[PDB]
Write a protein that binds this ligand. Structure first.
Ligand code: PFJ
Ligand code: MG
Ligand code: ZN
Length: 305
C-alpha cells in the first residue's frame, strides 16, 4: 500500500516513479483502480499479468520496464485531469496499452531493423516494432491465468483489444507528424468532434505521443538524466549502423555528442512543443505538460549559452 508521499505526488504530471522496481506494480494497480474502480480487475490475475509484462521488457538503457510504467503514469495523470471524457473501457485499455507499448524492445529503431534486414521487418513492414509490441501483448493475454479481460463480453474484449492495438501503433513517432497536423486543422476549423470515432482515435494517438515523450515534461534534473539513457541507446544503434557500413545520422553518432543541446532544441521545436501545444488546445487541463516542456526548452537554451 502507497506511502503518503507517493499518494500525494502521484497526482502531479511531473511525478518520477523512483528506483525501487518492486514498488512499480503496486503504483500501476493503484492507478488503474483509481481510474477504473477496484472491480475493474481480479487482483491475482492482474498481478500475474504485470509480472509477465515486466519479464518481457529487456534490460536496455531507455525502452525498458521503467519507461513503460512512466508512460502509464503520464496517461493516468491526463485521464485523472480530464474526468468524464473517456469511458471506463477506454481508460483501462489505454493504461494497459501504455504498460505494454514497448514490449520486447531491444533498443533499436524501425529504421535499423529495416537496414539490418531483420525478420520482424519482413513480417511487419511499417511500424515494425509497434506491430511486434501489440503481438507480444496479445500473446501475454493468451497465457493461462493472464486474461485480465476474461470478465468482459466477447464484443467488449474485441473492442478493448482494438483500443490497445491503435494506441500501441500510434507510439510509432513517424505517425505523429501527420496525426498532429490533422488535429491542428480540425481544432482550428472547429470541426473536431470527440463523438466521431475517427477523430477520438486521433486524440487518443496524440495522448499516446504526449505520454511516450513525457521525459521532456518532468523537472529539469529528471529530464536531463533521462536524456543520458535516450542517447545511450541511440549511440549504441549508431555503432551498429557503422558496423553495417552505413553512416548514422548525427543524433545516433556518438562522435557528434557535443551537438546534443542543438539536437534537443530541434526536437523540442519540431516535435515536443507542437505536441503539447496541440494537446493543451484539445484538453486544457494538460497545460502543466506544456509549461514543463517550455521550461525544459529554456534549460537546453541555457546549456547552449
Ligand atoms: C528528449 O529527447 C528525445 C526523445 C525521443 N523520444 C522518442 N523518440 C525520439 N526520436 C525517435 C526518432 C527521432 O525522431 C525525430 C523526429 N523529428 C525530429 C525533428 C527534429 C529533431 C529531431 C527529430 N527526431 C528521435 C526522441 C528523440 C529525442 O531527442 C533528440
Ligand atoms: Mg516504442
Ligand atoms: Zn515508449
Amino acid at each position: 500500500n502507497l506511502p503518503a508521499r507517493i499518494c500525494r505526488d502521484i497526482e502531479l504530471f511531473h511525478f518520477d516513479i523512483g528506483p525501487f522496481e518492486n514498488m512499480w506494480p503496486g503504483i500501476f494497480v493503484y492507478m488503474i483502480h483509481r481510474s477504473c474502480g477496484t472491480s475493474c480487475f481480479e487482483l491475482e490475475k492482474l498481478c500475474r499479468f504485470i509480472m509477465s509484462v515486466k519479464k518481457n521488457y529487456r534490460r536496455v538503457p531507455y525502452h525498458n520496464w521503467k519507461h513503460a510504467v512512466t508512460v502509464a503514469h503520464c496517461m493516468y495523470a491526463i485521464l485523472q485531469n480530464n474526468n468524464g471524457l473517456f469511458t471506463d473501457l477506454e481508460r483501462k485499455g489505454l493504461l494497459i496499452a501504455c504498460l505494454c507499448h514497448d514490449l520486447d524492445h531491444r533498443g533499436f529503431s524501425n529504421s535499423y531493423l529495416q537496414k539490418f534486414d531483420h525478420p520482424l521487418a519482413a513480417l511487419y513492414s511499417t511500424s515494425t516494432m509497434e506491430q511486434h509490441h501489440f503481438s507480444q501483448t496479445v500473446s501475454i493475454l493468451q497465457l493461462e491465468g493472464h486474461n485480465i479481460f476474461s470478465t468482459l463480453s466477447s464484443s467488449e474484449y474485441e473492442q478493448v483489444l482494438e483500443i490497445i492495438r491503435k494506441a500501441i501503433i500510434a507510439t510509432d513517432l513517424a505517425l505523429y507528424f501527420g496525426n498532429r497536423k490533422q488535429l491542428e486543422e480540425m481544432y482550428q476549423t472547429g470541426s473536431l468532434n470527440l463523438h466521431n470515432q475517427s477523430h477520438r482515435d486521433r486524440v487518443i494517438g496524440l495522448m499516446m505521443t504526449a505520454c511516450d515523450l513525457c521525459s521532456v515534461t518532468k523537472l529539469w534534473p529528471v529530464t536531463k538524466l533521462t536524456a543520458n539513457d535516450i542517447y545511450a541507446e541511440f549511440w549504441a544503434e549508431g555503432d551498429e549502423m557503422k558496423k553495417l557500413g552505413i553512416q548514422p545520422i548525427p543524433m545516433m553518432d556518438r562522435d557528434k555528442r557535443d551537438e546534443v543541446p542543438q539536437g534537443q532544441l530541434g526536437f523540442y521545436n519540431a516535435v515536443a512543443i507542437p505536441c503539447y501545444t496541440t494537446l493543451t488546445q484539445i484538453l486544457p487541463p494538460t497545460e502543466p505538460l506544456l509549461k514543463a516542456c517550455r521550461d525544459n526548452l529554456n534549460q537546453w537554451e541555457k546549456v547552449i549559452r
